[PDB]
Amino acid sequence: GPDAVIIGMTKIPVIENPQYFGI
Amino acid sequence: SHMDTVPDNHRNKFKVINVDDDGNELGSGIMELTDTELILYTRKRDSVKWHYLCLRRYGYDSNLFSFESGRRCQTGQGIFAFKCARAEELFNMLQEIMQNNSINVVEEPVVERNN
């Protein structure tokens, strides 16, 4: 999925920010 | 005092590598993790910044730290990952700064309207 950024060399399993959910 | 009273370096200042769509060092930078802005010190592009209220999706894989910035940026119009050897650490620090700062430059979006 897009929640891993597969930036060539490596797929980055990212997480979504609590900022948009903690305003 | 020095439990986690960290300096501007060692932890928060991480020399990353701006790598795009190939993990190719397209300008290996810094990723200066602060309260609300991820101050990426590029090569020739100067200290780029990523405010926390913009990091849609931010990550870490084998020396690759990423964030999907949901605004326009100096050099990151979306998922902009950097080959950050302290990716783990950086991403973490970031997620943790995220948790522990709540992140406001100023002007709260009127907390609890009830109007």
Q: What's the domain range around B45?
A: 1-115
- Total tally of structural domains belonging to chain B: 1
Residues of chain A contacting B109 with CB distance shorter than 8 Å? 23
Test A7 with B64 for CB contact under 8 angstroms: yes
Tell me the HSE value of B81 on the side-chain side, using a 13 A CA sphere: 33
Chain A within 8 Å of B85 (Cβ-Cβ)? no
A14–B57: do the CB atoms touch at under 8 Å? yes
Residues in CB range of B79: below 8 A, 6 or more apart? A2, A5, A7, A14, B57, B66, B67, B68
Cα gap B14→B97, rounded to integer Å: 15
CATH code of residue B99: 2.30.29.30
Do residues B31 and B37 make contact, with C-beta atoms less than 8 angstroms apart?
Answer: no
Which residues lie closer than 8 Å to B108 by C-beta, 6 or more apart? A23
Provide CB contacts within 8 A for B23, sequence distance 6+. A7, A8, A9, A10, B64, B81, B83
CB contact under 8 A, A19 and B60: no
Method: NMR
DSSP class of residue A18 equals S
Is A17 close to B21, i.e. CB distance below 8 A?
no
Tell me how crowded residue B28 is: count the other CB atoms within 10 A of its CB.
16
Is residue B92 classed as helix, strand or coil in its secondary structure? helix
Looking only at the bridges linking them, the beta strands covering B55-61 and A4-7 are: unpaired
Angle at B4 between CA A23 and CA B83, to 5 degrees: 70
Closest to B29 measured CA to CA, from B93, B79, B95, B75 = B75
Measure CA of the first residue to CA of the last residue in chain A; give whole Å: 27
**What count of CB pairs under 8 Å joins A to B?**
93
**What token pair was written down for B26?**
């397209």
Give A16's contacts in chain B (Cβ within 8 Å): 56-58
Question: Do B29 and B17 contact (CB within 8 A), yes or no?
Answer: yes
Q: Is B83 exposed, middle or buried (0-12, 13-18, 19+ CB in 10 A)?
A: buried
Name the helix (H) or strand (E) containing A6.
Answer: strand A4-7
Helices (H) and strands (E) in chain B, counts: 1, 7
- Amino acid in the structure at residue B67: F
